[PDB]
C-alpha cells in the first residue's frame, strides 16, 4: 500500500499435522493433560486443516479473530461456525479419525509428546482431493 509501510509478514512459522485414531478415552487424557498450542479435529481431509490453522494463527495474530484463542479460532474457522458451542459439534474431536495440528516455536516436540505419551496410532496423512481443496479454501479464505 502506502510507501513507508510494513513490511507484512506471511508467515506464521512451523505447522505440523497427523492423522490419527482416537478412542472417547483417549480424548479424554489428551484435553486434561495438554493445554497448549494445538488444537484435535475431525476433518475429511488434512489440507483444510492447514487452511484453517493458517488463518487462525493470523486473525489471533492481528486481533482480528472470533475466538480468542488460535485452538478455539481453528474449531470456528474449520467449522464456518462462529459460535464455539456450534463448531465443536460439527469439527470437535470425535471417536474415530482424527487430525491433530499443532503450531507455534516448539511444534514438531508438541506433536511428538503428545503422540508418544497417548500412544496414539497414526494413520496416513489424506490430501484433500482438488475439487474440495477448491471449496475449503473459498470457504476458508
Ligand atoms: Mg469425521
Known amino acids: 500500500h502506502h510507501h513507508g509501510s510494513l513490511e507484512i509478514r506471511t508467515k506464521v512459522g512451523e505447522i505440523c499435522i497427523s492423522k490419527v485414531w482416537l478412542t472417547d478415552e483417549q480424548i479424554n487424557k489428551l484435553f486434561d493433560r495438554f493445554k497448549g498450542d494445538y488444537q484435535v479435529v475431525n476433518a475429511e481431509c488434512a489440507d483444510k486443516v492447514i487452511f484453517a490453522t493458517i488463518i487462525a494463527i493470523k486473525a489471533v495474530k492481528e486481533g482480528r479473530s472470533i475466538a480468542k484463542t488460535v485452538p478455539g479460532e481453528i474449531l470456528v ?7 464455539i458451542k456450534e463448531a465443536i459439534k460439527k469439527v470437535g474431536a470425535k471417536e474415530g479419525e482424527n487430525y491433530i495440528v499443532t503450531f507455534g516455536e516448539n511444534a514438531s516436540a508438541l506433536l511428538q509428546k ?8 497414526e494413520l496416513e496423512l489424506e490430501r484433500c482431493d482438488l475439487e474440495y481443496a477448491k471449496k475449503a479454501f473459498e470457504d476458508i479464505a
Open 77 to 83: 474457522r474449520l467449522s464456518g461456525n462462529r459460535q
Open 114 to 121: 503428545i503422540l508418544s505419551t497417548l500412544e496414539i496410532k
